[PDB]
């Protein structure tokens, strides 16, 4: 009369990610109402999109405009492990997730005096297969997927960095053996080399509308 059943090996071990729920102790607790408790966020990429965070340019988010040639104010990898992204909320969020896809957004807010004027261009350099390079003048970077803006009444400029890669998803962490980037560079040229004096361009980053992380991981640090 007893129902036959066959317990199997390899099943029923403790699992820290298993769907099944634990057996109850107390019953009929009633939590205090959380109505009008403001600020809930149901998904981390939402706060990643609505809340841009500043880049780490040698400990200071802004880039200083400069008189000497050079012209390459910054030239950094579109990779979350890069030192520039080190303080950003996205690098800290993607420190955990294993893979991603989709565009990033970079916000450039000019901060200099109203009489001071400048012109800038940013360019996205696709991964190589590049013997270096990278281009150090705007005329050289013009060929690449770029955009260019001059300072005006509307200070901020939002440049979107496309996700261009052979594979549908790409690793957030960089593999130990590499002589070149797998997600490509981006660079922020000034384009006139006569600036008395100083000025500054604050830079920040936030996830694009279509960005998507996948596979949570909890890497041992260090």
């Amino acid at each position: 009369g007893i129902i036959p059943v066959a317990c199997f090996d390899g099943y029923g071990g403790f699992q820290n990610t298993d769907p099944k729920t634990a057996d109850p102790i107390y019953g009929y607790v009633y939590n205090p109402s959380r109505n009008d408790c403001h600020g809930r966020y149901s998904n981390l990429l939402d706060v990643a999109e609505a809340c841009p965070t500043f880049l780490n340019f040698d400990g200071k988010p802004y880039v200083v405009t400069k008189n000497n040639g050079d012209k390459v104010m910054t030239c950094f990898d579109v990779a979350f492990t890069h030192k520039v992204h080190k303080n950003t909320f996205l690098a800290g969020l993607a420190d955990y997730y294993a893979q991603y896809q989709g565009s990033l957004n970079y916000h450039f807010m000019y901060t200099g005096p109203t009489h001071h004027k400048a012109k800038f261009m940013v360019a996205y350099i696709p991964p190589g297969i590049e013997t270096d390079r990278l281009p150090k003048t705007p005329e050289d970077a013009a060929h690449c997927y770029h955009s260019e803006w001059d300072t005006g009444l509307n200070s901020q400029f939002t440049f979107a960095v496309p996700y261009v890669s052979a594979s549908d998803f790409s690793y957030t962490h960089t593999d130990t053996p590499a002589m070149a980037t797998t997600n490509g560079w981006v660079a922020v040229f000034q384009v006139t080399d006569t600036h008395s004096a100083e000025a500054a361009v604050v830079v920040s980053v936030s996830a694009g509308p279509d960005l998507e992380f996948r596979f949570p991981v909890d890497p041992v640090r260090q």
């Binding site: 090996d9 690793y171 991981v217």
Partner: protein, 189 residues
């Protein structure tokens, strides 16, 4: 049944040409989804290892048929054996670490550990062979794997392809050598 062979047109004649009828058979054991779906043995007495699916022995059914295909897609099921407390599994692209925490983990039950690994690799398809500047006039890249298992103690390991989809056929060869006799001749129980 003469026909030009240079065009490589398919030709399949039944004995009907000599007056013998032959009804079509509905073969099931030759089916890919049915054959590939088994726990092939892969490796013995090993703690940490990448879950590369090319670790399968080439003489085994699953490994040979897997090498009969250029591309493939599989959900996977791992089954460790031998004494051990627990088994961690890092999803593809997760950084390697000697210690592990919070990464997905399964305790053994009666010295067996079976669990299902979702397809993880970024590529829409994996491949058993990859022409990465290996030109010749006469090795697969690390991204091609389902994860990275680690065991508390060394364990035997099994892989089970699920929802298998093989693409672009490649040659099978018999493993046996005929030696002096042209017919191989083997014992049968």
């Amino acid at each position: 049944t003469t026909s030009s062979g240079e065009g490589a047109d398919v030709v399949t004649t039944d004995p009907s040409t000599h007056g013998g009828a032959v009804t079509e058979k509905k073969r099931v054991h030759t089916d890919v989804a049915f054959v590939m779906d088994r726990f092939t043995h892969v490796l013995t007495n090993r703690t940490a290892f990448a879950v590369d699916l090319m670790d399968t022995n080439e003489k085994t059914l699953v490994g040979a048929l897997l090498r009969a295909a250029t591309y493939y897609f599989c959900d996977l099921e791992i089954a460790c054996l031998g004494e051990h407390e627990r088994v961690w599994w890092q999803p593809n692209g997760a950084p390697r670490t000697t210690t592990l925490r919070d990464n997905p983990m399964v305790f053994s039950h009666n010295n067996v550990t079976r669990f299902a690994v979702p397809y993880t690799a970024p590529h829409r398809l994996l491949s058993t062979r990859y022409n990465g500047e290996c030109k010749y006039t006469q090795k697969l890249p690390s991204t091609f794997n389902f994860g990275y298992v680690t065991a508390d103690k060394p364990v035997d390991v099994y892989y089970r392809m699920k929802r298998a989809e093989l693409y672009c056929p490649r040659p099978l060869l018999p493993g046996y050598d005929h030696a002096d006799r042209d017919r191989f001749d083997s014992p049968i129980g």
